[PDB]
């Protein structure tokens, strides 16, 4: 996250931290995600496509720090890793960048809400907030485009939804933005998601509910003028989601 503020998991209790275990026994951070029901975390397919084996992944909930333990955190294995069959990576952009992780503890329990863990609501099918609505993004992504290290404490910031019309201007993204994506950015281009925030939530109030509107997908630099963050449009994927969350 570029700019914004350090936060804790209590202020973003649906946030899931996903890590991968390597052959050496080393474990490194992969992507963010969001807890949409006790047994299900939603993220991006680009995170997993290079190594799509469920066994190699660990999901933490209730975690406020990247490489140290938070009190109240809970560790889960991945019972199913579900990538979208129509995922593709374009020269600039990703398409259908959405993934589901069914989580289970070694004990066999799904998530249990607490001070530090809660689900986030899904939007109604094809229902989004209007352009200019303020939304929240959260993650352990870089604080600067040029950084080599990731922040150890969770960060969040506010961005505003951008119209499809505006996002499609060629000085923005031109043809590469589709209606299955949402753009969002700071009106002065001062704060943004960045490398390592991918898979994480874009959360907007829609009606009276904190709602998962976007999943962090792609963008050129971070906080760079005329280049918004691009997000998977969650409202366009409910059938896909419900087909899997029924088991």
């Amino acid at each position: 996250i570029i700019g914004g503020e350090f936060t804790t998991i209590e202020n973003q209790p649906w946030f899931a931290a996903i890590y991968r275990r390597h052959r050496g026994g080393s474990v490194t951070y992969v992507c963010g995600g969001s807890l949409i029901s006790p047994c299900w975390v939603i993220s991006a397919t680009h995170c997993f496509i290079d190594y799509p084996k469920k066994e190699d992944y660990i999901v933490y909930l209730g975690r406020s720090r990247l490489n140290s333990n938070t009190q109240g955190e809970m560790k889960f294995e991945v019972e199913n890793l579900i990538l979208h069959k129509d995922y593709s990576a374009d020269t600039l952009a990703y398409h259908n960048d959405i993934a589901l992780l069914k989580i289970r503890s070694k004990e066999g329990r799904c998530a249990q809400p607490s001070r530090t863990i809660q689900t986030i609501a899904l939007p109604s099918m094809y229902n989004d907030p209007q352009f200019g609505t303020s939304c929240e993004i959260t993650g352990f992504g870089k604080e600067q485009s040029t950084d080599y290290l990731y922040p150890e404490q969770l960060k969040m910031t506010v961005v505003k939804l951008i119209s499809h019309r505006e996002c499609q201007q060629p000085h923005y993204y031109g043809s590469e933005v589709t209606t299955k994506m949402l753009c969002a950015a700071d009106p002065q281009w001062k704060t943004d998601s960045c490398q390592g925030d991918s898979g994480g939530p874009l959360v907007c109030s829609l009606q009276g509910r904190m709602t998962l509107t976007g999943i962090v997908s792609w963008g050129r630099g971070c906080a760079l003028k005329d280049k918004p963050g691009v997000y998977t449009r969650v409202s366009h994927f409910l059938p896909w989601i419900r087909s899997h969350t029924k088991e």
């Binding site: 992969v30 992507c31 680009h46 995170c47 990703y94 490398q195 991918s198 997908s217 963008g219 050129r220």
Partner: peptide
């Protein structure tokens, strides 16, 4: 890796 990836691994 797309040129505008945000993945740690890109």
């Amino acid at each position: 890796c797309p040129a505008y990836s945000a993945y740690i691994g890109c």
